[PDB]
Symmetry: D3
């Protein structure tokens, strides 16, 4: 029935993202966790690494499929026949930017309905950018990450 | 069958509410538009009036069921077998209060998942309260309301 | 002659309001400081009192005219031939609500252009409501009010 | 001895308030939990009730003293020899209103320094008002309240 | 009488900016649409292109003059004898940043009064940065742009 | 008794920061004004210059010690035995980012209590980044800076 897309850079996937995609799969029949290449952001992890990490971290969720994309999100969503666009909404969100994006995406593909889900209190306050900054500066971020991502981040920073 | 509940005071239902419930029906098989008695708000219209107005305004949305309730919303949602809780969301929203409400609702019924939908730009600034303030001064609010609601507002005033 | 209207409840007028209306007069030829009766707010001062207080407080601003009104603000503005609607704006403002009000005002009278002005840092945190709360406890609010307004507040309390 | 005051309506005191006052005692030698009569809010509990509830709920915090007051908070703070004013702060807070209040408090007593503390994530969404709304519908709020407060809420309702 | 300045990077001018400058000309006798060079932002369009596009898009507004400037906005406004500073205020605005700028500009030139105007609902939600990002990623942004800017953006992206 | 840390990039220290650290010393027995190296931001002033400027500007405050640090703030605070973390909160603040940082720091070092102080109305509206941008573009920012910082900024921009 409903095909939902949950797009982002997922660099790397965090426990907050796991929370959101878990809620989405309880609500919609099929969820595509869609990872944007985003070369302009100079991601810490390559697209291949991000896809592999997200695949492992969502392996227990049967109706999640992880796939990378390099086009405009709406162009990808259209070709994949998604009709629901999953967004996270939490306490520290840039709320107006999220409203900008939802209006732009409705302009681009009105048949794709933005829906906002809210994570647990535990994951309401921390961005993945702060997680990476803290880890790179020798702070403990294990609490925020799936174990496979924890291992990959330790290795990435060790060789960096 | 995925069952969603769209609760509120709906005093009265506006074109913004119609937009949200319509978006909800495109996503979910059955949508319960659930009107809370809300006596602490001292509503302009009685619950029976609000239910009747919302019934007429949604009569052509076949997957919308309008009901009234006076108990805890989370218990009403469980008793209606709803698992999705529809909330409106827009750029002018006090989204932090919506977060507080969603966390309280989740404490009371964790199986009821809040989902925020965004109305059309046309209804991105309207509210029940602003409509009522303009109508109290005989200002023309027909643009913002279902026709049946406009008539009822004219009679109450 | 460009005619601006600066409407509100002014219950009572404060030094922040004086700052805004003064900035408005530097920009526009004639400024109508328009006091809404606002019965739903149950104001501390009657409309006649609020008009009298604002008249005295603006007596030395030659291009300010203080009036009272009880009808729809947009109709009053049209009837005064105003084409500019002055609103205050500051860092502490609920600017999204100001956007909702401006869009409703534009729906009612599109020819009346909302324009937001920013008060001095000195008045960047004051409000009528906070002044009244402190005064109800005999706190010294003389800094925030025209002298005539301070006296009237002392008598009402 | 650094003396802090933590004032509010505490109608009733919640687990969020307990969290804040506990954090305050880790920082300051003596903390006065000061309950304002607040008649304009028409509180659910009388002042004597609110003081009694907060006394029991803080009985094991040796450096907390619960008092009631009906005068201007800044004068009460001066009369208690407080130099630190504890305010709660969280992601859902209307922080601009907290800024307005802090600037008014500073105008009235510049020696009383506002200090904002952040509660635990567990209490990052609760409020007295939301607890009361759920309790009015017999919803289970025991998670959010000291046991003595839960009992008193059940009796008032 | 009143000389108003409406400054920004205008990279490129959008329908929202057209909306705001149109409202400004209905309110004030003369409006300078002032385009900051802004080399630090690495603008998509050169200053010459931005001025030409803004000139064409405002040609129907008799009391608008487009001019580029490379100095501090307040220094330019002072030398041009502007007394009104036009700012747009919309739903997705970084409101506190706009308050920062208004206070700084009042410090620099107190005789220049900041005034905020609000665009139509249609233009309340989309930044020019998102317009450029979407266009560069193969999305349709024609709705947001004057026709001359649409043509220039297509050509800029085609050769880029 | 209480050791408080007031950390930031202080690039350069401004009157608003002076305000906050003055309030902090009235409240806590010892305050460390701690300057993060922050090479990723490419600071205008070197760490040595920032420390020297902050030292001179706080020389009248007996219980302030200025020290530079290049590690994670929480790791430094822990090794220095700070138990209070001073943050400024003002009208134009990115409030949600400050909440993010406070939650992250509580995760890293729960024994370090974030406290927010509010500056005077005079310093409520202007960021140090805007001060530098305005000065670099030939605007007057003397009002916002201690005299020693004013002199250093004039010299930095003159030779830059």
């Amino acid at each position: 029935q409903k095909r939902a897309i949950y797009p982002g850079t997922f660099d790397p996937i965090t426990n907050g993202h796991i929370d959101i995609v878990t809620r989405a799969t309880q609500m919609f029949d099929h969820v595509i966790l869609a990872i944007a290449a985003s070369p302009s952001k100079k991601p810490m992890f390559t697209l291949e690494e991000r896809v592999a990490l997200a695949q492992q971290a969502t392996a227990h969720l049967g109706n999640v499929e992880v796939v990378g994309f390099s086009d405009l999100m709406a162009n990808f969503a259209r070709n994949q026949h998604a009709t629901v666009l999953i967004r996270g909404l939490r306490a520290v969100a840039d709320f107006e930017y999220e409203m900008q994006l939802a209006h732009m995406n409705r302009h681009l593909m009105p048949e794709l309905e933005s829906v906002f889900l809210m994570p647990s209190k535990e994951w309401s306050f921390i961005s993945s950018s702060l997680v990476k900054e803290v880890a790179r500066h020798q702070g403990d971020v294990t609490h925020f990450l799936p174990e496979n991502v924890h291992q990959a981040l330790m290795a990435k920073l060790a060789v960096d």
